Design a protein around this ligand. Sequence first.
Ligand SMILES: O=c1ccn([C@H]2C[C@H](O)[C@@H](COP(=O)(O)NP(=O)(O)OP(=O)(O)O)O2)c(=O)[nH]1
Ligand SMILES: [Mg+2]
Ligand SMILES: [Mg+2]
Ligand code: NA
Ligand code: NA
Length: 326
Amino acid sequence: TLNGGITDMLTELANFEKNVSQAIHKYNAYRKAASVIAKYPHKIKSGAEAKKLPGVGTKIAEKIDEFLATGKLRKLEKIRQDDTSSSINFLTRVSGIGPSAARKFVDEGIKTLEDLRKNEDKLNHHQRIGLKYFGDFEKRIPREEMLQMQDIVLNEVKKVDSEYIATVCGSFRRGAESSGDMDVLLTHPSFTSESTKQPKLLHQVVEQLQKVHFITDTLSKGETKFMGVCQLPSKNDEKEYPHRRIDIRLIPKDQYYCGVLYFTGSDIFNKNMRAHALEKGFTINEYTIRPLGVTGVAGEPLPVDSEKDIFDYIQWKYREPKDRSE
DNA sequence: CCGACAACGCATCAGC
DNA sequence: GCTGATGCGA
DNA sequence: GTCGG
Ligand SMILES: O=c1ccn([C@H]2C[C@H](O)[C@@H](COP(=O)(O)NP(=O)(O)OP(=O)(O)O)O2)c(=O)[nH]1
Ligand SMILES: [Mg+2]
Ligand SMILES: [Mg+2]
Ligand code: NA
Ligand code: NA
């Protein structure tokens, strides 16, 4: 929070570019700068000092001076006043509503929580669920609750098949005291990059978690990726816990490290690390790390036996999970 | 100056 | 139906 | 919006 004011400003600007402008690259540039400034161990006194950090350019340097002198940014001040932008930005907060459907809804005259509620029939499944838990999905999840959720997931998964290995990644694995959701990496010896000796692997787990009323709704569900909702059980007279987002990713067991690396993030850390690999001549995904031969075609998967092995290939000192929160 | 910007699963749709 | 582009996720 | 060749 040393430079919380500037990073918030950049984040707002980033959200503006992505939601209203539908300018994905500007969005990422602003996020990158906010991230780099956020890890800067000094209270920024000027734009110049900031323009020294990679990702902070001249344009952002100027905004930082304006922000420092007045404590605000006219560009954002105006944006906040534009009803259209204010509308689009609000709708994009509903899980399942992106920058495109948000603009489309505004056109259709649907621009408020009430509107959304009176036109539920005009939303797809995901959006319907997003609206249902609009408030809840805006709440953070205390690590304490994350531990309680981890317990149920791991115990339930063990009950389905003792050979299942469920690992909670995301911000939780990075050690955050609070998470936006629960991310679970799943593996089973029957599913390898070599073969799928058992079907319904993911389904079975989803099934078991629903039977115990942990998973309550499903945003999307395929063979290896589940996106849904869950809620911890409450005691007698106790108010119910809020509904929470839960992502489950089944990955080939022999590809666990590339998978766990990816699912631990952060998303920006993955961006930077993947960008670096490419500069080093490699391509990294949640499955493997392959070399890049001149032509521009990925090669065969290099052998990996740990997350560190991945770091070594790209000549990066190992960074524990707690230090990947960019 | 100007190409590149990380990578990919699932839902949805248009065209054949 | 299939496939491939697009939205969304974050 | 920023960067590197
Ligand atoms: O754009 C993305 C988003 C996520 N990810 C990876 C890293 C991230 O940590 C992980 C889980 O996704 P979440 O959206 O749950 N992010 P995270 O758990 O880090 O933060 P939060 O506490 O918001 O959930 O998936 C990417 O690689 N790219
Ligand atoms: Mg998460
Ligand atoms: Mg998640
Ligand atoms: Na800079
Ligand atoms: Na949204």
